[model samples]
Every structure is written in structure tokens, then in C-alpha cells.
Target: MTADLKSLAKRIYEAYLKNFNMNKVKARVILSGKASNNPPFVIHDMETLCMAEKTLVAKLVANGIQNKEAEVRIFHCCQCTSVETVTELTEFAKAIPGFANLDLNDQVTLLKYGVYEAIFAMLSSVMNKDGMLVAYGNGFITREFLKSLRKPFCDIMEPKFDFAMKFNALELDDSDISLFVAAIICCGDRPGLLNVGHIEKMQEGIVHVLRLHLQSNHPDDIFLFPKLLQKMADLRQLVTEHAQLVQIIKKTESDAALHPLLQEIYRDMY
Candidate 1:
């Protein structure tokens, strides 16, 4: 297992290196300012930026209810951004040698169960304690505004935002994010997995690599590895909570639209 793990780790690392440049480019496009985009706000200091975001959310919420068209637009933008990240992550997973060898059904199952956790991981890149940058930095949404959302919707994001606050304290970079996401994708415990042994092996290799990388990169932060593993566990809990929120949304906001791909993913999970 040790020998196999090293070989697998090398292969996965190479794959990550190959995609590294492109992944950074894609991440920047999704999380930062793009002049061509609407709501093209640039990144600013956390408090001020979140203040601006809160103002926008305030405008959209006249009385307790949100403006229908504005709500649709904001929801659509955020959904598309998240879906795009998920799509890229799916492709990234396929690029891993072991992952590509899995039965297609198993691959899909991994993605269905894992994508939300991965999404939340990526989200930490653009988030601070006060707020998150959504829609590729075209829109910023404050934690205060998130709490103001209707029940289940309110419940869904605030937990994630809170987690992001703590996760960001580690000051992870793109490389750390890539390894962490790989760990999420290679999870072996996802239900209905056809090759749990192989999947678990792959997960072990990824975790090993992540631990080594963190140790080398952050020698002073001796607790980083254990803390990151804990974050993974935290993310699993958060995703489960998020799934419950999705169910509530389906129940109470049946008329509200989710992107087709997101809706499909949500359905598959339930």
C-alpha cells in the first residue's frame, strides 16, 4: 500500500501540475473582477466591500420579500458561478488516473456527493469573515444579508460563511486549495460506491500528499495538517446541512428556480 500510494501520489501531483496554470486562470476569472461582466465590482477591503454588498441586497429586499426579477438574476448568477466551478472540478477529477479508471456510475456518484463540499472549499478562496464574493466578484454578499434570507435559505449559507472564516485563517493558497479539493473528490465513503477499496486508496494517497505539502509549506504551523483534516470533517457536516437546506427550498420555494445542473445534482444527492 505504501508503494502504491507513492506512485499514485506522484501521478496525481503531475496531473495537478499540468492543470495548475489553467486552474489558476479559471479561478481568478470566477472569483475576481472581470471588466466585461456586469455588477463588475472590484475587490476591496472586507468591511467596505461587504457594506456595498449589503446595500445591494437591501435594495433587492423591499419589505421582507425580495424583488422577483432581482432575486432571479442574483440567484441565477450565483448558481451559474457555482455550476461552472463544479463542471471544471468534474473535469479535473477525470484527469486523475485512478479516478478516470472508475466505472462511470461510481464517478458520477462521487461527484454528486462531493461537489458541494468542494464548492464550499473553493468558496473560501474569495471569502472573508464579513462576506463572500459571488458571481465572479461581480456581486458581493454580506453575512448580515445572508442571515436575513428566508429560513432555510438563511440557514444554508451562513454556516458555510462561518466555516470559511475559520478556514481562511489558515491562509491557504491555490496549491492548497487544489490538494484539498482533490481530497474531497477522492472520498471513499460516498454511498453506492462500486469500488470502495480503490476509492479509499486514492483518498489516502491524496491525503498523504496534502499532509506532506502542508508540512513542507507551513513548517511553523505544525497543527495545519490535523486542522485541515478536521476542516474536511467540518465540510462534510456543512454539506449535509446544506442538503437539508436544499430540501427546505424545494418545499417552501418550489416556484424559485435552480439551475438545471444544480437541481440535477441536488436530486441525485437526495
Candidate 2:
């Protein structure tokens, strides 16, 4: 069973990598040329740089998602990403030995709890210190712009950005990310899991292979496994905060559109 699990894990991960690479290519096409290298305005000192950054953020906000129909573009991109994520997640879950044999309700429950964690995990692939690349990188949302958002709303993403910086430093490839995401999906403690023992056992198998893979791949880094486990915990916290922020946005910005699937996921989770 362990050997079978390893093979299944590799197969699912390869599928994920194929989809992931396709998405990146699409993202690059959408993103096209990078943000201009030259600052829009000249800056001579620390204060000037800070002021310049703030100015740029303000201009972006003023243009508004509405003004350029950026919201529509953003919604489309997010929707595509969300759908692909769920599809791959479903593929991953079904590939796990005996997972599909579980009650259907349990399957839905695990997906509800696990999808966002997976979304954020994959998100690490595109992030940088600057900010998230929206609409397949067609738009770059600056960290300063995110910071300018309302109280807890602004707070939600900062931790994620911090985590992305650290996680990206580890330089794990798509294979590593796939195993980590699989481990997150099989979590036993998600609120309504029916077969906790089975789920935990599967997770243990995944983690066991993940540790070995990391050890072999990162031969000089003895701490990689523990660090990666700790990152999963960090991602859990970040997603929790993100959910809270989503709830607030749903209520306060009722007119602002979110993708329907995302809206459903957010509502169901809360």
C-alpha cells in the first residue's frame, strides 16, 4: 500500500505540474512585459521613496477596479484559477487509495476545508515581495496597495506575503508543492471529517514520502522537513485570517463582485 501510495502521489503530482505549467505560460502571456523598470517618479531619499510608493498605490486605487473594468478581468482570472484548483484537488483526492471509497459527504467536507489552503499554497508560485500578480499577472497589485486597505482587511495579506517570501526561499519545485498540498488536503482535524483515522493515516504516508524527497533533494538542508511542516501550520493561520477578511468584504462591499464559487466557498466555510 505504501508503494502504491507513492506511485499514486507521483502520478497526481505530475498531473498537477502539467496544469501548473500551463497556467504559468498563460500568466506570462497575460502579464506580458514586466512592470516598467523605471520608477514612475524620481526619488532622492528614504522619505521620497516612501512618498513615491504611497502615491503609486493611491493612483491605482483611484483608478479603481470599476474604472478599467479590472474587476471583471480579476473575477475571470480568479474564477479560472479557483476552478482549476478544485479540479486538481479533486483529482488528488480521488487518486489517494481508498479516499473515493469514503462517504460522499465527507469528500465535500474535506474539499470545503482544504481548498483554500491549497489555493494559497499554489499562490506561492507567483508571489514576490512586491505583491500578488492578479489576472494571470496582467495586473500587479503592490504590497503598498494591499497595506492601504482597511484595518483587518489589510492585515489578512501581510502574513501571507511574509510566508511567501520565506517559502519561496526554500526553492521547492512543483513536485514538492504537490506533495505538500496533498498533505494539507488530507488533514484529519478539519471540522467535520468522518474518517479521521483513515485520513490521518493517509496524511502520514504522504508526509513520510515528502520528508524523504526533501532530504534527498535538499541534501545540505537537514531542517527542510521540519521547516516545511511549520509552513503548513503558518498557511493554516493565514487562510483563517483570509476567510475572516472575506466575510467582512462580503457584508460591507455587497456590490463589489466576487466569483460565485469563491463566494460559496467563503460562505460555506464561515
Candidate 3:
């Protein structure tokens, strides 16, 4: 039984790195920096903001929308990425071993609650204190520029960057993140689960393996694992705030289309 969990952990990690897309992972690490050729991300500079705003404005008109306020353009780009993120999250969720065996309802429910938090967690991989990677690491989103957007949209990213900055401190590599992402999904706390014990068992195993991975990899800092889980707790709060902002967008910015998948994820949230 114990033997199974150990191998199971290995199998899951392997699946994570392989399935979540190394094409993504490689670009992530590139942005993550080992002095690699990180596409110039500028901070405390006005031109970067100019460039970012110009690009969004062009994108808006190119897509045939003429009223290109920063609010509308930023909302459009963000939803596009959220759509991509949710699709990737879905694929990764389905790929988790034995995950499909859970009642279809439980699988769907966990994903519904967990997806946003997990996205916040993984954003650290592509992010820095000043900005984050976008366009698959081809473009950079300047943090100051994000703050420049109008209400709710501006409200949305500041909190995330604050958390993203702190979360980036731990410097968990891709493999470490693989376990973290899996743990967040397998988390048993989400409501409406048909098999509470079953989900808990899965989370329990993932947490134990998370500890083991931390022990072997982060032996220098004993507090890393606990602090990391604390980040998980913070993710819950972030999602609450994010959903409220999103609900406002859904109502006020009715012209923008929330992707069907994102709408499903946000379906029941008030």
C-alpha cells in the first residue's frame, strides 16, 4: 500500500511535467531566468507602457472593435488568456491518475473550485515582481501598466501581483510545481463532493509526496513546505476577490464574451 503511494507520486509528477507541456515549461524557465535571453521586460519606464497600450489598442481595432479604452482592450486580452489557461487546466485535471474514476460530478466540482486558485499559483512561474510573461513568453505584461487600467480590472491584477511576488520567493522548480498543482486540484476541501473520503485520500497522498519532495529538494529551508501550503490558503481568498471582479465584468462589460468554458467555471459563483 505504501509502496503504491510512493510509485504513485512519481507517476503523477512524471505525468505533470510531461502533460502540462514542456513547451510551456521550457518557456516558463526561460522567463524564470538562469540569465537566459529573457525578452527585455522594462520597469519604471514609460515607453513599455506606451508599447503595451498601443499593442492592445491595435489588437482591439484589428479585431474590429473601435472603442478601445484600456478597460475594454485589457479585458479582451485577459479573457483570451483565461480561456487558454482553463483549457490547459482541464487537460491536466483529466490526466491525473485515477482522477477519472471519481464520480464525474466530483471531478467537475473540484475543477470548478480549484481552477482559479491553481492559475494564481502557476502564474508565479511566468511572473516577476514587475511583470509577467505573456504570448507564451513572447510578450511581457508590465505590472505598472496593469495598474493603469480602469476599475475592477485594475483591482483584479494588483492583488494577484502582490501574491505572485511573494509566491515567487520560494523558487519552486517545475517538478516542485507539478506536485503543488496536483495537490491543489486533489484538495478535499471543495464542497459538494460525492466521495469526500476518496478525494481526501488522494489529497493526503499528494500532500505526503509534496512533503517528501520538499524534504529532498529544499532541505536547506525546512519551512518551505508549510509556507507553500499557506500560499494555497491565500489562493482561496484571491479567488473570492477575483470572482467578484469577474462578476462585475460579466454584468458591466456585457459586450465582451466570457469564453463558454470560463463561464462554466464561473457559473455558480456569485
Task: Pick the lDDT winner.
Answer: 3
Better of 1 and 2 by lDDT: 1
TM-score of 2: 0.73
Prediction RMSDs, each to the true structure: 6.5, 7.1, 3.3
Task: Flag regions of model 1 displaced more than 4 Å.
Answer: 1-72, 268-270
Q: Write the per-residue lDDT of candidate 1 for residues 39-105, one digit (tens) a residue.
A: 4354344444445457557544543325353334345446766777777778778655578888899
Please list the residue runs of candidate 3 whose C-alpha ends up more than 4 Å from where it truly belongs after superposition. Answer: 1-10, 21-66
| Cα misplacement distance, residue 202 of candidate 1 (Å) | 1.7
Candidate 2 or 1, higher TM-score: 1
Q: Supply every candidate's count of residue pairs whose N, Cα or C atoms clash at under 3 angstroms.
A: 0, 0, 0
If ranked by TM-score, best first, what sequence of candidates would result?
3, 1, 2
Evaluate model 3: give its TM-score: 0.84
> Which candidate number maximizes TM-score?
3
- Candidate 2 ranges beyond 4 A from true positions: 1-9, 21-80, 137-139, 148-156, 268-270
List the lowest-lDDT window of 10 residues for candidate 3. Answer: 38-47
**Can you write out model 2's per-residue Cα lDDT over 66-149, one digit (the tens) per residue?**
243332323334556677777767776776556787778777877887888888887877677776665344345667756665
